[PDB]
Design a protein around this ligand. Structure first.
Ligand SMILES: Cc1cc2nc3c(=O)[nH]c(=O)nc-3n(C[C@H](O)[C@H](O)[C@H](O)COP(=O)(O)O)c2cc1C
Ligand SMILES: Cc1cc2nc3c(=O)[nH]c(=O)nc-3n(C[C@H](O)[C@H](O)[C@H](O)COP(=O)(O)O)c2cc1C
Lengths: 348, 348
């Protein structure tokens, strides 16, 4: 069972190939602090048996939040909460990781269960194009703004390391800031940071480069990207392959291949494993390690995509919301004697 | 779906018919205090959707423990831990309950994963018969000893109420103290507390009576019994029916029908729902409310035993060790829109 074999990234060993995909809980305080919700939520899934927990999109600056209840990492005030969260994940048996994010032109929306409506924040982006009707028009960034955000990512990464997180993921996906620089559906700049493919990758690669310099090479840096945006004339798999080549040269350890979110009016052919082709192509054609994610719900499915060489790591999102001990039970289904906490041995 | 309809006991409303069966975690401190293990373990299952959590066998005196790591309730020192545990269960959406126990002649064994061997404690019992080879010979109780233990149960119940537990279960099952008084395989006394059926029930009914007086009538008192001991000439279903009649008259709200554990050398015909006949007979022939427990693992199974009138409450043990969110997912399988925490709505 490949699913339960260790994986070495940098000098870190993950004890299996299952990872908890970052999922916003919208339950931080109004200043982005860890609460009791996270301190129960995440350790539950570490006892559940994942090798790696990626903590949700954590905002590198206040206007980078998706909602007023998102986690933050822009102040030394965030460090005590984050350090405790990382400790509890670690003590429950999983490697603690965290996703650093800036929401860009999709910043400032209400929580999904309080309507999800935009709140009219002063959002920033590559070009002056609203995400959708009702959303504020973003203010195009200049080079001093780009520099300010890049340092917010760099300082976020440093703070995450001091908290004890051992895996940093940069969120360059789903139409948030860096994702929106990559796609021509949202980036229409005519300066060094729009038009060509090389220009569109320029700012995201600057952020990745700078974060890579502050994260020691024995700890993994992950990047998450929207591998296509599903739109007429948009970011495609071929562009992802080019972007992935650059990330590899620069020392990114793994590419977490998602898709969509740049614009709203597109056909997305949802099915089990529908983003696996992107991980597979990156892995096989570029030779960069990949994370597969997207409607992966079954042990036999997860093992099969690893057997096929379509990814190195399987990320699980929604299945771990409704079934947090999935990894323990998946072992049995694959003929592996599960390592369970001794308290629970008689349930297995 | 009966499984998701409320149940009224005394003046308490449980929001569904699923309950977490008491299960020793062997993770208290050496003085029987609540630790971090319980504070994560139990709230997880309350978020999982059970209407009622019964906290594990909690020892009414030190020599009543099953192991050195069992929870206790014999000192005001236990109250802060227990009060916090009851609070967190309650805040995660479940009614908090607790099982009061005395291990009797099976007291003082090592944790299951450290060998399970008897530790040679000075155990007490009805008669001078070891549980098995290697176990100490119990010291037969006299009436001052019986009185001392009865007050330990009474004071335990008072302390549990002050902690905020709203359901008290008395553990009179599985060959522990009170169970061992009921069965002739372990009770061979010739005084007022052995020989006849009425004598064998006399001490257990005194304990139940006295605890019922300190628990207000608007809060449920439950009793758990071994409905048969599976042994030649032992406690049988007919004896359970007689014992249940007495508990009903005295104001016990519910009988939690388990089986076995009095002696070791017996054939137990394990199968899904194998203790359901005992709950069914008590419920239908005595008219006392019952809890069904024992290899109940499936939503359709649980609903079916309720449809049949075999019980009022379904208790789940091992399934909640390996699958803590079972109740949320069971709703969907029965065509009920589950109430899930808003954070997890997209997993359902
Ligand atoms: C409630 C919710 C919150 C999410 N939050 C994030 C996030 O903060 N960052 C992110 O990259 N993806 C986020 N996602 C996307 C998931 O990480 C995952 O990629 C996606 O749900 C597909 O995997 P699944 O089918 O296993 O859920 C979220 C998804 C859900 C349903
Ligand atoms: C690890 C473990 C600990 C248990 N501890 C207790 C206990 O403290 N009190 C009790 O009455 N029953 C205890 N039981 C029995 C369960 O409560 C339950 O009645 C039994 O496991 C059958 O139900 P199940 O098939 O749903 O597990 C325990 C069972 C297990 C496996």
């Amino acid at each position: 069972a490949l699913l339960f074999t260790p994986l070495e990234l940098g000098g870190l060993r993950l004890k299996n190939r299952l990872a908890m995909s970052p999922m916003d809980q919208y339950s931080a305080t109004l200043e982005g602090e860890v609460t009791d919700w996270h301190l129960l939520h995440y350790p539950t899934r570490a006892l559940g048996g994942v090798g790696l927990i990626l903590v949700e999109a954590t905002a590198v600056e206040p206007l980078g939040r998706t909602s007023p209840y998102d986690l933050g990492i822009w102040s030394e005030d965030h460090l005590p909460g984050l350090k405790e969260l990382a400790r509890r994940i670690r003590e429950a048996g999983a490697v603690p990781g965290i996703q650093l994010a800036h929401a860009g032109r999709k910043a400032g929306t209400a929580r999904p269960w309080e309507g999800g409506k935009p709140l009219g924040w002063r959002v920033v982006g590559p070009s002056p194009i609203p995400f959708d009707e009702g959303y504020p028009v973003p203010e195009p960034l200049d080079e001093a703004g780009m520099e300010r955000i890049l340092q917010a990512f760099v300082e976020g990464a440093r703070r995450a390391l001091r908290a004890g997180f051992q895996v940093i993921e940069l969120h360059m996906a789903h139409g948030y800031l860096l994702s929106s620089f990559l796609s021509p559906l949202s980036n229409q700049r005519t300066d060094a940071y729009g038009g060509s493919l090389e220009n569109r990758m320029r700012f995201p690669l600057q952020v990745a480069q700078a974060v890579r310099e502050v994260v020691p090479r024995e700890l993994p840096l992950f990047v998450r990207v929207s591998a296509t945006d599903w739109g007429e004339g948009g970011w495609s798999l071929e562009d992802t392959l080019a972007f992935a080549r650059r990330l590899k040269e620069l020392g990114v350890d793994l590419l977490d291949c998602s898709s969509g979110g740049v614009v709203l009016r597109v056909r997305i052919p949802l099915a089990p494993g529908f983003q696996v082709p992107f991980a597979d192509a990156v892995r096989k054609r570029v030779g960069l390690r990949t994370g597969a994610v997207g409607l992966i719900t079954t042990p036999e499915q997860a093992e099969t995509l690893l057997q096929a060489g379509s990814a190195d790591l399987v990320l699980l999102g929604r299945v771990l919301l409704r079934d947090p001990y999935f990894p323990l039970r998946a072992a049995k289904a694959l003929g592996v004697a599960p390592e369970v906490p001794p308290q629970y041995q008689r349930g297995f």
